[PDB]
Amino acid sequence: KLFKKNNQVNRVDLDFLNLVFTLNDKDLTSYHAEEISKLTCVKNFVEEV
């Protein structure tokens, strides 16, 4: 109880930055990821902005 208190103070989410890749290949395929990446770059959320 005397250690785990600075958790949320200076935590940078590695999973949110996609660095847990070694644990992401269990349900990942190449073509789906490439298709999403191609249909990712803006062009869908900046228009209403």
């Binding site: 949110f16 290949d25 073509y31 789906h32 298709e35 999403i36 990712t40 062009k43």
Partner: protein
């Protein structure tokens, strides 16, 4: 500099790309000389690129700092991409869990190149919006609305209960396999971006693909067969690709994989890609390694090895007798020799100037000539460090040019090896012998 690479001692030299004539030039791509050596290296590189003959060998000798590692790196650069290079030094084979022989075998297995192709099918754009008229799935047909065709698909026992599988609100782009495959979500739509303020990590929004649905997609992979060995080593052998607990791969898997690659090459599904092996300073290696390679380099899949060392008449490690080059006669027979030569003033000054350019360092005439004198009386590496230290002095001296001032300050504050040895021999009193002989007393 795609990666976090900063600079190389030889970064100006990227590629032994000899001209179409293959006749060496006095200057090319930053390198000067090595004429017959460069011609032979081009011949070797072409022979490697041939991809039809295995079991060749070339030996490199000569004093170090003559671009030997730069020579190999330029060869690799001239070989382009899709050809992984085995970066293994002499002191990397005496591993704990990997014996030297099968470690060399693993290095060769990595060194091979292969290509694989595959084909699959999917459905794209399935903005479904199921609506049926509880359970049981009576009249089990689903609306499918992509950009091109917008119809209703009839289903059966596997889908009318497969649509209730992957429970979704049916307002998103989904993928199904027309070849009797399962259902996979590729993300929601932009209209679903606004319905929930903070979308969950699972929920992502991607537009409906602009086209038809039945997509027959081909894929191509370039994976070494040793990776497949690690994959099929155990029932779930996917964690071991990066951890490194291979475990001295058995030869039964090796010959099974050889048969599989041969039959896939005959089927046309796979094709080979040449590979190279290179280890520096082969002299500091066990005689067992030389004995093993002298037999293992004539196998059917025997990529060439870039032998290189610089020692003299010594003993092969693992024996007692005097040996040529510290290498056995058997290894010094089934190969061809590359040798280097002592530096001359012109290439010394040109290489120093090129390095200064690579370091974003400006050198004037006096500093260049003085450092050429240093690099000809000593080796060029001392001058290659001195250009850096002198540019640091200059930029601390409120100028960018390097001249006699910074060079002389470096010379006074940095000691040559010969004068260092003289200082050692004349001040041995403060030094220590093997037996701990130190004169700590002063007065």
């Amino acid at each position: 500099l795609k990666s976090l690479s900063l600079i190389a001692a030889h970064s100006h030299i990227t590629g032994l790309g000899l001209d179409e004539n293959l006749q060496p030039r006095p200057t090319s791509e930053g390198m000067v000389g090595q004429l017959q050596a460069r011609r032979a290296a081009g011949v070797i590189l072409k022979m490697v690129q041939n991809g039809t003959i295995a079991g060749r060998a070339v030996l490199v000798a000569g004093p170090p700092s003559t671009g030997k590692t730069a020579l190999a790196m330029g060869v690799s650069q001239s070989l382009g991409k899709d050809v992984p290079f085995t970066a293994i030094a002499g002191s990397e084979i005496f591993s704990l869990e990997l014996s030297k022989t099968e470690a060399l075998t693993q290095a060769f297995r990595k060194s091979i190149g292969i290509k694989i192709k595959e084909e699959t099918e999917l459905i794209e754009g399935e903005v479904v919006e199921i609506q049926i008229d509880t359970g049981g799935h009576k009249q089990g047909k689903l609306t499918i609305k992509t950009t091109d065709m917008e119809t209703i698909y009839e289903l059966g026992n596997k889908m009318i209960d497969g649509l209730t599988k992957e429970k979704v609100l049916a307002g998103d782009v989904i993928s199904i396999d027309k070849a009797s495959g399962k259902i996979t979500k590729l993300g929601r739509s932009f209209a679903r971006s606004r319905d929930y303020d903070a979308m969950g990590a699972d929920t992502r929004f991607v537009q409906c693909p602009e086209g038809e649905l039945q997509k027959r997609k081909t894929v191509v992979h370039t994976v070494s067969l040793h990776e497949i060995d690690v994959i099929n080593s155990r029932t779930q052998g996917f964690l071991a690709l990066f951890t490194g607990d291979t475990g001295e791969i058995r030869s039964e898997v090796r010959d099974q994989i050889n048969t599989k690659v041969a039959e896939w090459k005959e089927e046309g599904k796979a094709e080979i890609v040449p590979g190279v092996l290179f280890i520096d300073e082969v002299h500091m290696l066990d005689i067992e390694c030389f004995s093993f390679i002298n037999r293992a380099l004539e196998d059917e899949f025997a990529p060439i090895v870039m032998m290189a060392t610089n020692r003299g008449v010594s003993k092969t490690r693992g024996t007692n007798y005097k040996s040529p080059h510290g290498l056995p006669l058997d290894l010094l027979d089934r190969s061809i020799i590359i040798t280097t030569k002592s530096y001359n003033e012109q290439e010394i000054k040109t290489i120093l100037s090129i390095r200064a350019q690579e370091e974003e360092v400006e050198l004037s005439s006096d500093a260049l000539d003085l450092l050429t004198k240093t690099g000809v009386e000593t080796s060029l590496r001392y001058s290659s460090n001195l250009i850096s230290v002198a540019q640091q002095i200059a930029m601390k001296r409120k100028n960018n040019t390097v001249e006699v001032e910074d060079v002389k300050r470096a010379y006074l504050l940095f000691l040559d090896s010969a004068r260092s040895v003289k200082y050692v021999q004349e001040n041995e009193s403060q030094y220590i012998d093997d037996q701990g002989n130190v004169q700590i007393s002063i007065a």
